[PDB]
């Protein structure tokens, strides 16, 4: 996250860190807890990965430097990548992770609410993106979970900044014309959440953008409402 600040405990209790351990352990992506055994993230987080035994999913953690060999983590039972996701193309950048065991809910570990199928922003005027990703292009993973407030941009205006790519109705964009505040490398798969009437909901999944926090280059997110039929079907069928 570029231009953000340090979060406090319990602000973002759905945020998870998706890490891998081969010989060394590293944070790769964010994700959102959406039910007791389900994390929602980006499909591109699985491109160029070994099989799932490598993953360690941390929840209820604010600071990655607080993680030790004894810190509990979740393991993966199932990965459900959208059937129509193709890496070169980048549409349908969405994936479900089923955990090996359900998590107990606490103030620091609980699920984000989901939108209804076929929902529109606006109504979303107060949106935030979180993660442990780089704080500048060519930066490094941050220790304390970062937060930043970013306005949604219309698909028409987002499209003008991305002549080579089609901005579809299944994407949502967010950013400042002057840049300076954005998701970045390592924020993939994490949440774009908006507070409406006191309650937070998951509006987007961090996906792509040109560099990080450049002027006139908004972040692009998978629009969760446009995949609600898929999320429900896949999680019901598995459960």
């Amino acid at each position: 996250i570029v231009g953000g600040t340090n979060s406090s405990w319990g602000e973002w209790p759905w945020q998870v860190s998706l890490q891998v351990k081969l010989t060394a352990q590293r944070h790769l992506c964010g994700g959102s807890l959406i039910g007791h055994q389900w994390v929602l993230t980006a499909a591109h987080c699985f491109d160029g990965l070994p099989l799932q035994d490598v993953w360690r999913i941390y929840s209820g953690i604010l600071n990655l430097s607080d993680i030790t060999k004894d810190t509990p983590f979740s393991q993966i039972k199932e990965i459900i990548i959208h059937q129509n996701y193709k890496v070169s193309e980048g549409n349908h950048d969405i994936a479900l992770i089923k955990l090996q065991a359900p998590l107990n809910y606490t103030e620091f570990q609980k699920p984000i609410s989901l939108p209804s199928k076929g929902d529109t922003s606006t109504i979303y005027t107060n949106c935030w993106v979180t993660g442990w990703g780089f704080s500048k292009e060519k930066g490094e993973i941050q220790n304390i979970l970062q937060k930043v407030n970013i306005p949604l941009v219309t698909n028409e205006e987002c499209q003008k900044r991305y002549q080579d790519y089609k901005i579809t109705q299944r994407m949502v964009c967010a950013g400042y014309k002057e840049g300076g505040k954005d998701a970045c490398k390592g924020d993939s798969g994490g949440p774009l959440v908006c507070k409406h009437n006191g309650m937070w909901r998951l509006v987007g999944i961090t996906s792509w953008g040109e560099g990080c926090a450049r002027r006139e280059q908004p972040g692009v997110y998978t629009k969760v409402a446009e995949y609600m039929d898929w999320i429900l079907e896949k999680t019901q069928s598995s459960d």
């Binding site: 980006a42 591109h44 993939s188």
Partner: peptide
């Protein structure tokens, strides 16, 4: 994954 994506080896 293309460079526009945000995973560490895109």
């Amino acid at each position: 994954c293309p460079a526009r994506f945000a995973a560490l080896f895109c």
